[PDB]
Amino acid sequence: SVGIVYGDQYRQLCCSSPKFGDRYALVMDLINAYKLIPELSRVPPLQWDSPSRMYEAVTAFHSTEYVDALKKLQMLHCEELTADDELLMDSFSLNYDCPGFPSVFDYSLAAVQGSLAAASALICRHCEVVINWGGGWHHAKRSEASGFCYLNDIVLAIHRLVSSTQTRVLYVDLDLHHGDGVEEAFWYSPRVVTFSVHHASPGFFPGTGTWNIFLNGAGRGRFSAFNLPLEEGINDLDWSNAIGPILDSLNIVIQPSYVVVQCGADCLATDPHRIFRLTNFYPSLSGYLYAIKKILSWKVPTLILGGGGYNFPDTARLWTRVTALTIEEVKGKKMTISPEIPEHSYFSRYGPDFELDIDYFPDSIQKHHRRILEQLRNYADLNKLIYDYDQVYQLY
Ligand SMILES: O=C(NO)c1sc2ccccc2c1Cl
Ligand SMILES: O=C(NO)c1sc2ccccc2c1Cl
Ligand SMILES: [K+]
Ligand SMILES: [K+]
Ligand SMILES: [Zn+2]
């Protein structure tokens, strides 16, 4: 039973931003064109009994003043801003990368509604895995919008998971960018282990998840925040070998109750960032599909979320394959996807070849592996977890 977050209103809201435009619609219509929808349990986004209940849910992480500012920003964009209102927005970074637009609050709230409903479906055991392609806004902070992330749906979903009972959550962030917002939220918590693989280089957004020595959490959360910064140009195989032993070692040591995976598609070779060279190939084998298949082999209730990805048809091509892989891994039912894009309302967006495969022809890691292994040992010692060092050592 694989769950997928969707709904008519949800679709309209996810498609209402100037940055992500109709991406979510392309993603969901491609999944539907590949006849995957009948295999999936629709997870309806969470709706609240009152404005107070909605505030209680969002303020489990964000400050009231920030939520008030975001709701006022939407109101203001539904009618220019005064000098005092511009100052107020600037105090929450609601500007530049995170501008206001008529549906800014509804749009960012929708991802939270989706990811909280997805966590609830895992908690009641209705779904083994839940997918939310409208979610994964990893950069949003308590009182600050960042990288087009206004509300952090991941933190709120993880917070719902961790507090459902000892519950431990493993958060794996596959996006090109460092998952700073999620890592910061759980910096002092040993029960949420964060691991982000990403590109890092001077002046590259958001700037964290790299050498500062490496910070890895604080207080009781020391050694609980893991990071693997990778150089530009990394391909499927090298990225797969870089993350594989880390994922496996985290699962053996942490023994998570839940896994939350952020699957931002900006690592694709065809993403306009043009930083990593990952594919959606399923014979080289896509780094994403290798990582997703590995996580699902653990048989731990999992939450799969979206994130980055500016090349909309290529993000759809990758997420359609992630979706089919999840059905296969959970149900044990073969999913056969035709290499040609099937006819549907968005067919023309996949041109000029109309194929499912993206249009692409293809010591530092060992040093990070040793650093990460030491951190995992340190985390295990601080948290009094029983583990076999040799079983973990041999994975690398
Ligand atoms: O509840 C389960 N088995 O009894 C399963 S099967 C499976 C496959 C992938 C991820 C989670 C999961 C769970 Cl939980
Ligand atoms: O895909 C993204 N993060 O995972 C990012 S980073 C960033 C920085 C400025 C503006 C947007 C943006 C997005 Cl989207
Ligand atoms: K990442
Ligand atoms: K942590
Ligand atoms: Zn990104």
The domain that contains 125 carries what CATH number? 3.40.800.20
Number of residues in the chain: 396
User: In the structure encoding, which two tokens stand for residue 167, read together?
Assistant: 């519950």
What does DSSP assign to residue 293?
H
The residues with which 41 forms a beta bridge, in sequence order, are: 3
Count of structural domains, the chain:
1
Residues 6+ apart with CB under 8 A from 145: 70, 92, 93, 94, 97, 98
Residues 6+ apart with CB under 8 A from 200: 178, 207, 208, 209, 210, 229, 230
For residue 265, the Cα-to-chain-centroid distance in whole angstroms is 9
What H or E segment, with its residue span, contains residue 65? helix 64-76
Is 266 annotated as ligand-binding? yes
**Residue among 193, 201, 173, 291 nearest 241 (CA):** 291
**Residue among 185, 342, 326, 173 nearest 261 (CA):** 173
CB 304 within 8 A of CB 131: yes
The residues with which 304 forms a beta bridge, in sequence order, are: 131, 261
Solved how? X-ray
Resolution, angstroms, 1 dp: 2.0
Residue with tokens 């598609």: 265
Say how far apart CA 335 and CA 331 lie, in whole Å.
10
CB 303 within 8 A of CB 128: no
The residues with which 3 forms a beta bridge, in sequence order, are: 41, 130
Ion ligand 4: protein residues whose beta carbon lies under 5 Å: 186, 189, 192, 221, 224
CB 99 within 8 A of CB 150: no
Say how far apart CA 175 and CA 124 lie, in whole Å.
28
Other Cβ atoms closer than 10 A to 93? 18
Using alpha carbons, list the distances in angstroms from residue 362 to 276, 279, 368: 12, 9, 25
| Omega before 272 within 30 of 0, i.e. cis | no
User: In the structure encoding, which two tokens stand for residue 103, read together?
Assistant: 């549906």
Ligand 1 atom closest to 330 (CA): 8
Say how far apart CA 241 and CA 244 lie, in whole Å.
5
**Residue among 360, 348, 391, 393 nearest 374 (CA):** 393
User: In the structure encoding, which two tokens stand for residue 62, read together?
Assistant: 């964000």
Is 363 annotated as ligand-binding? no
Ligand 2: centre distance to CA 27 (Å): 19
Active site residue 139: yes
Say how far apart CA 162 and CA 185 lie, in whole Å.
13
Residue with tokens 């995992």: 376
CB 145 within 8 A of CB 18: no
Say how far apart CA 245 and CA 342 lie, in whole Å.
37
Breaks after residues in the chain, judged by C–N over 2.5 Å: 79, 165, 212, 283, 362
Q: From the candidates 62, 139, 159, 198, which is the catalytic residue?
A: 139
289 class by beta-carbon count within 10 Å (0-12 exposed, 13-18 middle, 19+ buried)? buried
- Alpha helices (runs of H) in the chain, residue ranges in sequence order: 8-14, 23-33, 51-58, 64-76, 83-90, 104-123, 153-162, 180-185, 236-254, 287-296, 312-331, 364-382, 389-393
Say how far apart CA 166 and CA 292 lie, in whole Å.
25
Other Cβ atoms closer than 10 A to 102? 15
Ligand 2: residue whose CA is nearest its atom 10: 147
Q: What is the CA radius of gyration of the chain?
A: 20
The boundaries of the domain holding residue 249 are 1-396
Measured at the alpha carbon of residue 381, what is the angle toward residues 209 and 210, in degrees to the nearest 5? 10
Say how far apart CA 299 and CA 156 lie, in whole Å.
23
